[PDB]
Amino acid sequence: TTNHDHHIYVLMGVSGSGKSAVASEVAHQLHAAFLDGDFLHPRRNIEKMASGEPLNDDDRKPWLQALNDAAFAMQRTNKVSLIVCSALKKHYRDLLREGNPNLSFIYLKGDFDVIESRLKTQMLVTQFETLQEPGADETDVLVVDIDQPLEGVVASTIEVIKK
Amino acid sequence: TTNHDHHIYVLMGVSGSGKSAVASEVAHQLHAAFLDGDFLHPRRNIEKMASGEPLNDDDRKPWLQALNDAAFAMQRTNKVSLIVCSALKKHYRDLLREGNPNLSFIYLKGDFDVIESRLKARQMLVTQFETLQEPGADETDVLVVDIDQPLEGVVASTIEVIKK
């Protein structure tokens, strides 16, 4: 039931890296399916998040699981699928990869100053702390330079789904 | 924690009535948020479908819960949220309504002739119209939109209805 011709792109990166804005535009340009993963967070996680707490590994497990099922669902009937999901850790990425050999990552990149100077500084401090940038041991990960205008980021995102 | 200034629109109707393609154009045209409900079925249902097995109320219960949750999550940070769900039974509509007084439906409506032919160009269909319970006078949060129009026409009509 995996359609190896079909593909899922997880747009990943810290909060404020413009993930949603990119995925939406790219998806309209490409007529792709699009799922903002924030929406799948379980009520508990949002309470915690909204209250001002940063989540941990076990808060995210059930969420990542939910993204995994939705990628599977989406690759059934869409040639190209986009999922916004921060996927900060390598272990989280692995959870998304399971049973999804046709799923890969677009890492919308930038460092602390760019992002901050793009915009709660603390939230942002903790994301970068949690971020584990994917090394040479993750073959299915492409990177986009977000130190550019939205339109250029979208286009680089496009040239990478089409490369 | 519902936010009454924000609103969720669920596009209902039988498969082939164009739900997803309409929602996308509207969502993009309105900088609105958009969730195609099909993507939230559990593995369970998706494996079943892969086996040409058409679902019953039970397969749908957890799917509909998941949707209800997404609706709520979506309305935290979006003035306008769009969700695609065929939602043919009244009981499913109420299942979406729970805790979401701020969610209504856009019933994308057309006779069988009109959807039949959209499908051929892409049995379940007859069955579908069969399962479809049309929302009566007692469902007050239901707007209807005629789909025997050019898609741009249908898109324009769904926006008209949301701005009402």
Ligand SMILES: [Cl-]
């Ligand atoms: Cl972001």
Ligand SMILES: [Cl-]
């Ligand atoms: Cl449809």
